[PDB]
Amino acid sequence: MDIILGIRVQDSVILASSKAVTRGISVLKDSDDKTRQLSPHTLMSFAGEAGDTVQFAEYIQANIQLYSIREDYELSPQAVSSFVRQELAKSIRSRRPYQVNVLIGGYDKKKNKPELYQIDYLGTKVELPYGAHGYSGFYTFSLLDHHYRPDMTTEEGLDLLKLCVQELEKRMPMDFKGVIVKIVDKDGIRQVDDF
Amino acid sequence: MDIILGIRVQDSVILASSKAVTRGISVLKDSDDKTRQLSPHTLMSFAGEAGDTVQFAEYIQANIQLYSIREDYELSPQAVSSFVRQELAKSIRSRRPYQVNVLIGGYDKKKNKPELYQIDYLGTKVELPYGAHGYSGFYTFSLLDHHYRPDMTTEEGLDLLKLCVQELEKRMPMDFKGVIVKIVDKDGIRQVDDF
Amino acid sequence: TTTLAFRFQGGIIVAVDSRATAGNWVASQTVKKVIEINPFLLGTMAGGAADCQFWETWLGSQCRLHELREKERISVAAASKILSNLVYQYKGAGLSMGTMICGYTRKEGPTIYYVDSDGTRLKGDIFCVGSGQTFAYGVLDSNYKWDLSVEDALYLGKRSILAAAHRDAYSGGSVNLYHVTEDGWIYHGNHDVGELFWKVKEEEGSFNNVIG
Amino acid sequence: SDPSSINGGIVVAMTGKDCVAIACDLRLGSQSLGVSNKFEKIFHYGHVFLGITGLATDVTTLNEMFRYKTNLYKLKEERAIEPETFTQLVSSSLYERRFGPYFVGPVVAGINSKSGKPFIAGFDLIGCIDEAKDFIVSGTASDQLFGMCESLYEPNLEPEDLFETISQALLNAADRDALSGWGAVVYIIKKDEVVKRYLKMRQD
Amino acid sequence: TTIVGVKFNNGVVIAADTRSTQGPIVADKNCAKLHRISPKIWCAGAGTAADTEAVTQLIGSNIELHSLYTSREPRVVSALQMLKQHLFKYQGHIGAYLIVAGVDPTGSHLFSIHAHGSTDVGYYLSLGSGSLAAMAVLESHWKQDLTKEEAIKLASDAIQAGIWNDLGSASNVDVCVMEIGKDAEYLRNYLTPNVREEKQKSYKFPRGTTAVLKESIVNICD
Amino acid sequence: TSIMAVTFKDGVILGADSRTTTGAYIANRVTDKLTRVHDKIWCCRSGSAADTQAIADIVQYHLELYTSQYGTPSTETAASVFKELCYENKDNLTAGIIVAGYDDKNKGEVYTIPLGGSVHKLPYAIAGSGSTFIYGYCDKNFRENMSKEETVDFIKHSLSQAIKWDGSSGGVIRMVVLTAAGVERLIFYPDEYEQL
Amino acid sequence: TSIMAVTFKDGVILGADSRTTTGAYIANRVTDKLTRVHDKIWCCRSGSAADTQAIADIVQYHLELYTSQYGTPSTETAASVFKELCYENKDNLTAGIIVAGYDDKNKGEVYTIPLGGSVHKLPYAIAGSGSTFIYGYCDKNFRENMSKEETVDFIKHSLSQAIKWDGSSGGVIRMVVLTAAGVERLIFYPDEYEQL
Amino acid sequence: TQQPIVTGTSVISMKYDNGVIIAADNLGSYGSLLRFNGVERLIPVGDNTVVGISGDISDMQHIERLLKDLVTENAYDNPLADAEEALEPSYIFEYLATVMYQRRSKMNPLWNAIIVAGVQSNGDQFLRYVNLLGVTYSSPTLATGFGAHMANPLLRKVVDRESDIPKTTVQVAEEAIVNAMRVLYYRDARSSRNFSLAIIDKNTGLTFKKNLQVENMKWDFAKDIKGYGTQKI
Amino acid sequence: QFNPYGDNGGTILGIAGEDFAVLAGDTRNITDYSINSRYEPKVFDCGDNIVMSANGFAADGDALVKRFKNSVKWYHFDHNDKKLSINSAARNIQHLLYGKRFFPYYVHTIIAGLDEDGKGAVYSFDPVGSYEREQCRAGGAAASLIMPFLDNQVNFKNQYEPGTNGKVKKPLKYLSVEEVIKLVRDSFTSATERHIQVGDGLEILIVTKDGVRKEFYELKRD
Numbered sequence A, B: 001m002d003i004i005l006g007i008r009v010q011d012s013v014i015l016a017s018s019k020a021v022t023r024g025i026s027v028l029k030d031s032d033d034k035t036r037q038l039s040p041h042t043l044m045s046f047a048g049e050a051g052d053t054v055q056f057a058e059y060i061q062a063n064i065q066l067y068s069i070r071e072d073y074e075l076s077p078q079a080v081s082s083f084v085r086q087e088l089a090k091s092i093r094s095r096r097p098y099q100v101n102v103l104i105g106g107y108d109k110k111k112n113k114p115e116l117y118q119i120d121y122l123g124t125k126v127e128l129p130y131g132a133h134g135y136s137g138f139y140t141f142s143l144l145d146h147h148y149r150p151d152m153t154t155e156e157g158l159d160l161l162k163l164c165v166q167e168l169e170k171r172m173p174m175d176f177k178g179v180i181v182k183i184v185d186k187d188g189i190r191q192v193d194d195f
Numbered sequence C: 001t002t003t004l005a006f007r008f009q010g011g012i013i014v015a016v017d018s019r020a021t022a023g024n025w026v027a028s029q030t031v032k033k034v035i036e037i038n039p040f041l042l043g044t045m046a047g048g049a050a051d052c053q054f055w056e057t058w059l060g061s062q063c064r065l066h067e068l069r070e071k072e073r074i075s076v077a078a079a080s081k082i083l084s085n086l087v088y089q090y091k092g093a094g095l096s097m098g099t100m101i102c103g104y105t106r107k108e109g110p111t112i113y114y115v116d117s118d119g120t121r122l123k124g125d126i127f128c129v130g131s132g133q134t135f136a137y138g139v140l141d142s143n144y145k146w147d148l149s150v151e152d153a154l155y156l157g158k159r160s161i162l163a164a165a166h167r168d169a170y171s172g173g174s175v176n177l178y179h180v181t182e183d184g185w186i187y188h189g190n191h192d193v194g195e196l197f198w199k200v201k202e203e204e205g206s207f208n209n210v211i212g
Numbered sequence D: 001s002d003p004s005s006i007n008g009g010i011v012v013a014m015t016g017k018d019c020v021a022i023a024c025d026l027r028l029g030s031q032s033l034g035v036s037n038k039f040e041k042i043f044h045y046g047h048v049f050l051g052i053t054g055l056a057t058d059v060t061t062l063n064e065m066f067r068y069k070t071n072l073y074k075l076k077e078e079r080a081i082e083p084e085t086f087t088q089l090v091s092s093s094l095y096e097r098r099f100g101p102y103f104v105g106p107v108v109a110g111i112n113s114k115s116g117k118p119f120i121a122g123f124d125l126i127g128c129i130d131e132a133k134d135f136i137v138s139g140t141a142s143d144q145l146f147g148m149c150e151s152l153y154e155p156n157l158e159p160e161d162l163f164e165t166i167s168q169a170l171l172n173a174a175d176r177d178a179l180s181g182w183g184a185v186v187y188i189i190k191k192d193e194v195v196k197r198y199l200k201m202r203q204d
Numbered sequence E: 001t002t003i004v005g006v007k008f009n010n011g012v013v014i015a016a017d018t019r020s021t022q023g024p025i026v027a028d029k030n031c032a033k034l035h036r037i038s039p040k041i042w043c044a045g046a047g048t049a050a051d052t053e054a055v056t057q058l059i060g061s062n063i064e065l066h067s068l069y070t071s072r073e074p075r076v077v078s079a080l081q082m083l084k085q086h087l088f089k090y091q092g093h094i095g096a097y098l099i100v101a102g103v104d105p106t107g108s109h110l111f112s113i114h115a116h117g118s119t120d121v122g123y124y125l126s127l128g129s130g131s132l133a134a135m136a137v138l139e140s141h142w143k144q145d146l147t148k149e150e151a152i153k154l155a156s157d158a159i160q161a162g163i164w165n166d167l168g169s170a171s172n173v174d175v176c177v178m179e180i181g182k183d184a185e186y187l188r189n190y191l192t193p194n195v196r197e198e199k200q201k202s203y204k205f206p207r208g209t210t211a212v213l214k215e216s217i218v219n220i221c222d
Numbered sequence F, G: 001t002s003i004m005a006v007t008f009k010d011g012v013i014l015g016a017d018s019r020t021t022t023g024a025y026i027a028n029r030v031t032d033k034l035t036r037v038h039d040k041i042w043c044c045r046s047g048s049a050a051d052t053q054a055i056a057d058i059v060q061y062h063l064e065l066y067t068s069q070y071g072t073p074s075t076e077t078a079a080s081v082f083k084e085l086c087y088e089n090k091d092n093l094t095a096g097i098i099v100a101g102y103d104d105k106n107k108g109e110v111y112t113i114p115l116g117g118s119v120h121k122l123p124y125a126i127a128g129s130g131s132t133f134i135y136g137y138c139d140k141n142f143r144e145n146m147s148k149e150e151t152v153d154f155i156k157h158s159l160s161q162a163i164k165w166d167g168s169s170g171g172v173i174r175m176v177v178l179t180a181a182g183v184e185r186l187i188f189y190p191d192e193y194e195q196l
Numbered sequence H: 001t002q003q004p005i006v007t008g009t010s011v012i013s014m015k016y017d018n019g020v021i022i023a024a025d026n027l028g029s030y031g032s033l034l035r036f037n038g039v040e041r042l043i044p045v046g047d048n049t050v051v052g053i054s055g056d057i058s059d060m061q062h063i064e065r066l067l068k069d070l071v072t073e074n075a076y077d078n079p080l081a082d083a084e085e086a087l088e089p090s091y092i093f094e095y096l097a098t099v100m101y102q103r104r105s106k107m108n109p110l111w112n113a114i115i116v117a118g119v120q121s122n123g124d125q126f127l128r129y130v131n132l133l134g135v136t137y138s139s140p141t142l143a144t145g146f147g148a149h150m151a152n153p154l155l156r157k158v159v160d161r162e163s164d165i166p167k168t169t170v171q172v173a174e175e176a177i178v179n180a181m182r183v184l185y186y187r188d189a190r191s192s193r194n195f196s197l198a199i200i201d202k203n204t205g206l207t208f209k210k211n212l213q214v215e216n217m218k219w220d221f222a223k224d225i226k227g228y229g230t231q232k233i
Numbered sequence I: 001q002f003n004p005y006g007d008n009g010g011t012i013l014g015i016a017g018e019d020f021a022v023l024a025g026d027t028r029n030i031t032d033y034s035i036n037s038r039y040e041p042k043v044f045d046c047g048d049n050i051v052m053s054a055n056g057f058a059a060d061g062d063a064l065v066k067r068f069k070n071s072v073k074w075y076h077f078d079h080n081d082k083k084l085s086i087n088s089a090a091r092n093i094q095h096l097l098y099g100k101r102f103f104p105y106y107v108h109t110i111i112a113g114l115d116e117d118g119k120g121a122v123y124s125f126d127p128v129g130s131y132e133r134e135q136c137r138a139g140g141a142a143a144s145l146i147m148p149f150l151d152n153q154v155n156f157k158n159q160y161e162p163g164t165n166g167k168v169k170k171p172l173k174y175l176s177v178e179e180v181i182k183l184v185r186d187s188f189t190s191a192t193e194r195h196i197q198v199g200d201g202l203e204i205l206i207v208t209k210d211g212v213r214k215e216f217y218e219l220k221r222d
């Protein structure tokens, strides 16, 4: 798919992901949720080749849910991100690699810290304060470089995210039909229904 | 460029043309007028390869304006469309052809009739009640097939044109930044400033 | 390459970077991507160094010949169109140019034209051209207003290039500023990014991802 | 397309008098787009230091692999691995992927705990050992680094002098490379103390 | 790379240069291109460096185990056969071009192996980018019934021809001498044309020249 | 490469040049292309040196193991082992081999195995890049039941011309004589055969 | 194609096969590849039939006009006109021509002009696809100052072998004799030359 | 753009104390076929210059005619054609070098490598190279094709730099050239035993030697070489 | 297919002083792994106190230099023996290069001399005519090795003043001709070590108000 953004503020991680699904000349859907909850305090957004994106996300989801049941314990975002990276790093040298780029937004309940990880289809992991995949970063990183702070509130994070989406809506050629925004914090995961 | 539409109603021809100019990854402009007045009662919209479009349109414009001064007389839309077709038909077998598709909307003052001509870069001319170039027709011709009449008013033509633009905005992947609409009738050419 | 130019209350702001590359190799950090066509016209340079340099200094010769024959300053529209018509003749041959022809005349006021080696000629209020154009657009679009002071507009243009110099690998070196008014252009210095970055970071409180 | 120059980055190592130094930039990008300025390329397993340039996913993978192997080595051998031995382990491990290699340019640096002798070594992506006395370079600005090292370097430098030489080699080489920079780290290594310094450099 | 092998009346001598290159860049100014397969069997290698090192050690390992199994000194034809059959297996993808030499209970031997697995026999041989310079010297000065001292000179003269005239060859000259009845003598940097020349200047920096942001002690201990 | 094998009254003689080339560079000017797969069964090799060596080595192994179980093999049997390898691996090989041997029962026999892996029993055979230039000469001058001296002259003259015209051929002319008497090796240097 | 020209005591003789092929189909089995550019200057044609005809026609025109102005041209002059066309148009031609002629001053002369457009004056020359197989035979059997009958036998035997081995060559063996006596055409059929 | 058909291999040359030597074999190859065995590839221009040409023979014959025409043209209205205004090696070279680069710039090159060897009016030795690309260079030793790889190393052992030229005699130089020609016959698959050699001395003038042969060849050691490794018989 | 271009190796270096300028370049000429000449001059005196070098494909380099020298000659004829200023020469060369924009001179051109105020000047060109006045510029094969060294040792990049720790830069003091020649020699000695196409000899042309002087130094011949 197209645009997926992530921003880590003081006490939460915010993921924004486009709603459009365009197969060639037609926009088939304008309300697609490009994300999966891996665990109560860990969310993963994704974008890449059709089919592979969802197949990969649900495969990861299942594995983390299996771990959670076996140990009666939630893995740290760092641990989940490392598991995901390894799967992609294994995948890139497969017969047919997963063509999927992901952002992993999680709240570590042990450290009481939000954490954002950006991983591409090669298995290239980086922890960031804010991240993006595809052409999104080309427009949005300049704004985030200017406006971002580590001590921002969730509301300020959302306002800065609106400024990113506005810039994308102005300068990007493709109509991505807005974004679904989700917040990950100590209380879990919730969706901002008005954006 | 991208989307150009034309519709011939009872007493006028209406041309709608997208405002976006996208050079690669960025939308450089969102207020571009993809049209030239060839004579007081003849308007030509255009779309194709960058540079060629404007270069061709202005070349045609100059030629028709030269004719107008020499004869102190306005050529019929049919005559202008035939001149334009010949230039493109000459062009297609040139060293470097004009990669330009045009719609010519004119009001024939002699016959008191609106006339719409669709001509592609090969020099393929057809007179139509409504026309389009590029991927626009794929969405819009079904609506026009259903809703169009030869006896429609200009206001009804504009309402039917809004329905076309709405469908394009819903299903086309590219954000073409709306359209500039222009009406060609017995009183000349005018622009609808609110659309 | 990152170049920008935008219209506002106090005329035009033009800001460019200084980097030139050959693959991953940084060939130069001291390139002049602004050409002073005359006391009222500026041209920005992006793409092929030789193509832009050669044809923009040639453009100056044509503009000079115009005002000799017509006893009048050439319009920004006419000057830009001389360049666009020229490159259009060479279309397909492989010229690589992304330019902004910026200036001020009485009849036009402050005017900017985007001229392209594909033959594209566009009039507008804001333009960013080059490999780092997207980075510059972000800062510009979120802070632009018509009612900006020459001082604030200059800083915005300078800051928008800095943003691009940081993120774009093929942009950087230093920032050249120009301000175009009713009485001509005015150079506003060369600003090394190696000093400007740390200065802006400290004073502005931005760039919190980098450590310093 | 070229895997060794997608992410970008550099590593350099130098020997001094009873000391070694290893340094790296902090950039990780996706071609022209800079992504991270905290991507360190130097790791250590006990007292042996390993710098790795090239494709970032492999940099990460190999680090995790050599941590894995040096940890088992230690459990069985009941001692930490030495630079000379680790060098052979890196070569072995790379060559086993001869026809499906890791796209990397590793650099080993450290001091032998028994002899006290300073040691550096470089490799190609498939295991060939370059065991230089003076210096080792790696990455997208290796040509630049070779020129800087070959002119600036002199033998038997003291730890605090070696720091200046290697830092200036890296910095000026990175500033002539579009895909290197965005910060830098220098490790100064002595027989029983190691100092890590982050350098201030231009952020473009 | 210039590598050479010359037979003499009571043994055989091997030689090589010491340059390694990535394109036009010099990677190592003192690469050791002479390898030990067994104590009295050495081979010189050109081509892909990792392949020459790896294939030389693998066969060296198997030769050692074979020697122990058979309770005998290893032969040169055994190394030759093991090497060529391995290189052939990989249809030239293992870029090892070798000159194999040694003494064993059968006598003294000199061979060459190409990456595809073809072997040759001779009294004098050369491989590498500088092989043509070296062979021109060998074809001009070789005679049969050489002494140990004459053969070493001929070999090192051949290696010099490559050093000067071939851009892929430079720096020092390594030699190894395998004589019958004697221990093999590996002559690392047998010839060093004299050196680098002192540099007009010293570029040692003033301490504090480099700007620093942070410092910390690294915990290497357990 | 210029190779040939010729049957005569007392047995068979194999002949070959000694040039190995990498493009236009002569990598070896004293090559031995006459190789032994059994006491009195030899072959002439043309094409890839690596392929023809590997094949010959495998054949020698097969005939050595044959001999240990069933006694001395026939020349026809040796040719069949060559054929089996060349035919079954025809996609991956570039080998043109002439097999020649001496039995007491069958006397001198010659089998040629070109690129495809086909076998052809002949009175004499020529192969290699330089063979093209001596098809006319060899056809005109060959006779059956020649003497040893006549056959040596025939091979010497034929390969002399092949060498003269083919750049891929040169050096010395090696020959191997196979008779009841035993195995004799011959060599002829440029100064001898060039003046013919 | 198998063509050759041979100088001898009384003059020169040209020889050629008569096969024209389109792939493996013999489009013409009775072709005349011996063509006349002047009374006693002829040529042998190999390569493209269209190219070699066009060239020969142009040469005949040049020598006809030469003769009208300056009298009978030399064989060397004819070869130069061939060369000029073949050399200057080397990118667009596929022609291998042998020029042979008889002067009273110079007697029999032979010039060969291969693909590149170079000229080579020789005692005798062979060309065409089938020439490859008779380099050895022709080199061994050619003598200078042969008789007419010896030269006819030399050409007949040589082309017989060239035809035997080359599939692009065949049919009849045509010959043209150039002497002071005049111009004599000879022909030799398969039944005659195959049994040689 | 073309491809070479009938070709000539190495041309080797070197300076010595009183002049220059140049040599080249008499072969005209046609791919792997050693087609023409009597080709002169050394072409003298006057009594002070020799042009050695390798590569495409048809282009060589064209150049040969240009040089012949150059001599004729220089004589026109020139009373000093056999004296002060005679053709120098430097004139002949520069002409060829101009033609070669012009032809490469039209993408229709003369597929050759040329060495102009001669002695100037003031007695100075002239030796310079030019090829199909119009690339030119001068050195105490010059060689084309395989000669560059095999001959130069041998000739450079005699004259390694400019200061070795006055110390090198014509006998030593000729000896080195003749040895190099032997080595090329051992190792170049497109060489012939027969060759031509030319000496241009400032005292004795132009000495052009034809029908030379490679002699004193070592082949006897071939008898001892058996098999390709393990074979003993 | 015919490739009209070639690579003759070599490396050049121009440094502008306060009242002088130097243009240096090695004297080695190569193709692939072979040396054509150990002494083939690459930097030329073009008259009017201007020195020039066109490094890369020697045929195009020689052609360009030849044409520019010719341009100087005709500039004298057409403009009453007026001296061609270094800035005027630079612009003239841009037009020579760009004239072949669609079939370029495959060379990196540098010129050096003095400006009209008597100060040292160096101009650098790309193959298709883009140019810029610089204080320092290396060109050719080993340019990537040398330029960073010059950024550090001529413009004092990344160098600060001890004690201040990154706050105060090393001041940009002017360099003497003796100091510049040391940097040039060390640059070419370093380049020779790590680049195979660089060596044999170094020739430097120094330009002052008094005229053009030459200096020659040996380099390693391997």
Ligand SMILES: *[B]([O])([O])[C]([C][C]([C])[C])[N]C(=O)[C]([C]C1=[C][C]=[C][C]=[C]1)[N]C(=O)C1=[C]N=[C][C]=N1
Residues within 6 Å of the ligand: C001, C002, C019, C020, C021, C022, C023, C027, C031, C033, C045, C046, C047, C048, C049, C050, C052, C130, C131, C170, I126, I130
């Ligand atoms: B900029 O990147 O467009 C820049 C502008 C120019 C005026 C210096 N161009 C370059 O850096 C180009 C390469 C390039 C990089 C990225 C996008 C487009 C083009 N470099 C050159 O033209 C050049 C000129 N001389 C020497 C080396 N490189």
Ligand SMILES: *[B]([O])([O])[C]([C][C]([C])[C])[N]C(=O)[C]([C]C1=[C][C]=[C][C]=[C]1)[N]C(=O)C1=[C]N=[C][C]=N1
Residues within 6 Å of the ligand: D123, D124, D128, D130, E001, E002, E019, E020, E021, E022, E023, E027, E031, E033, E045, E046, E047, E048, E049, E050, E052, E128, E129, E168
């Ligand atoms: B010599 O040229 O044969 C030499 C032999 C010696 C070094 C073992 N070879 C090399 O130096 C090779 C050249 C080469 C480059 C690229 C692909 C294949 C071969 N060098 C290396 O293998 C090499 C060594 N270290 C780092 C990188 N490459």
Ligand SMILES: *[B]([O])([O])[C]([C][C]([C])[C])[N]C(=O)[C]([C]C1=[C][C]=[C][C]=[C]1)[N]C(=O)C1=[C]N=[C][C]=N1
Residues within 6 Å of the ligand: E114, E118, F001, F002, F019, F020, F021, F022, F027, F031, F033, F045, F046, F047, F048, F049, F050, F052, F128, F129, F168, F169
């Ligand atoms: B002969 O030319 O066919 C010869 C016979 C071989 C058994 C020594 N072959 C070669 O010389 C081949 C190349 C070749 C030339 C002509 C036709 C077919 C093949 N050479 C090699 O196999 C070779 C060359 N250099 C190194 C190793 N092997």
Ligand SMILES: *[B]([O])([O])[C]([C][C]([C])[C])[N]C(=O)[C]([C]C1=[C][C]=[C][C]=[C]1)[N]C(=O)C1=[C]N=[C][C]=N1
Residues within 6 Å of the ligand: G001, G002, G019, G020, G021, G022, G027, G031, G033, G045, G046, G047, G048, G049, G050, G052, G128, G129, G168, G169
């Ligand atoms: B001979 O084979 O070269 C022959 C000589 C020609 C003068 C009659 N040429 C041909 O037969 C050619 C094909 C060819 C075969 C072998 C080598 C080169 C060319 N044939 C034709 O030109 C031809 C075939 N069919 C119709 C017309 N022309």
Ligand SMILES: [Cl-]
Residues within 6 Å of the ligand: E119, F031, F032, F033, F049, F053, H228
């Ligand atoms: Cl062999």
Ligand SMILES: [Cl-]
Residues within 6 Å of the ligand: G020, G031, G032, G033, G049, G053
């Ligand atoms: Cl015909």
Ligand SMILES: [Mg+2]
Residues within 6 Å of the ligand: B118, B119, B120, B124, B125
């Ligand atoms: Mg149509």
Ligand SMILES: [Mg+2]
Residues within 6 Å of the ligand: C164, C165, C166, C167, C168, C169, C170, C171, C172, D203, D204
């Ligand atoms: Mg940058």
Ligand SMILES: [Mg+2]
Residues within 6 Å of the ligand: E162, E163, E164, E165, E166, E167, E168, E169, E170, I221, I222
């Ligand atoms: Mg060398």
Ligand SMILES: [Mg+2]
Residues within 6 Å of the ligand: G163, G164, G165, G166, G167, G168, G169, G170
């Ligand atoms: Mg037939």
